[PDB]
């Protein structure tokens, strides 16, 4: 997260970290057994970490659970990042508590102008590298399709939306992939891609969760 503030410990209880040695993507706990993330986050041997704030330091609310199964969306395209979504089933259910809680799925898509919360442990510099210890937050509006498509000519499919600021200066960024974009208490977005971070006229691009609610509720209750 570039431009953001510090969420505070466990105030975003559905945020998880995907770890293979180190933190490399986020995700969102959508019940005690399943997390949603970006399909480009797929790796074999994911460990999922719940109840984190400081990723380097054990504060004892955490739960560490391996992924038992990862189900990349059937129409995922790694060249275009279209359908950039994936479900991870946990090897055990997590315990839900006040630090560890799941986020609802939307019943409709959200409109342009609607303010959302984005979180993650990714890079906080738009030039250079600075990776934080503690979870950062950002509030950012869904931008129009027009303005998205013109920011990224050719690259915006119907499964994506832009959120952020055409001015630059605040955006998500590397190591935030797969993490939540939450608007009115529903998971609308997954952190997916951008051209740089926080660059003027290049807002972040997010997977459009409302286009997938069926496929998720399908997959989850069938696996």
């Amino acid at each position: 997260i570039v431009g953001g503030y510090t969420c505070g410990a466990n105030t975003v209880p559905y945020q998880v970290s995907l770890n293979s040695g180190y933190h490399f993507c986020g995700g969102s706990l959508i019940n005690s057994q399943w997390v949603v993330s970006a399909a480009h986050c797929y790796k074999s041997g994911i460990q999922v970490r719940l109840g984190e704030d400081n990723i380097n330091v054990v504060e004892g609310n955490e739960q560490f659970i391996s992924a038992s199964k990862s189900i990349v969306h059937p129409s995922y395209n790694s060249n275009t990042l279209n359908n950039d979504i994936m479900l991870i089933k946990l090897k055990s259910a997590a315990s839900l508590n006040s630090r560890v809680a799941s986020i609802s799925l939307p019943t409709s898509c959200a409109s342009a102008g609607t303010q959302c919360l984005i979180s993650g442990w990714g890079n906080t510099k738009s030039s250079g590298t600075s990776y934080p210890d503690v979870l950062k937050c950002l509030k950012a509006p869904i931008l129009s399709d027009s303005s998205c498509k013109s920011a990224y000519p050719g690259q915006i499919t119907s499964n994506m939306f832009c959120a952020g600021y055409l001015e630059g200066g605040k955006d998500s960024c590397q190591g935030d992939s797969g993490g939540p974009v939450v608007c009115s208490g529903k998971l609308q977005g997954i952190v997916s891609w951008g051209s740089g971070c926080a660059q003027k006229n290049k807002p972040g691009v997010y997977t459009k969760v409302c286009n997938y609610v069926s496929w998720i509720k399908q997959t989850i209750a069938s696996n």
Binding site: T80, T129, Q155, V191, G194
Partner: peptide, 29 residues
């Protein structure tokens, strides 16, 4: 450029996804 927001160590550009490149402190971006 299309660069996914994953945290990925690299040593050369060609290590990275998509049209990310390998930047100065050994991470894609």
């Amino acid at each position: 450029r299309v660069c996914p927001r994953i945290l990925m160590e690299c040593k050369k550009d060609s290590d990275c996804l998509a049209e990310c490149v390998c930047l100065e402190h050994g991470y894609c971006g």
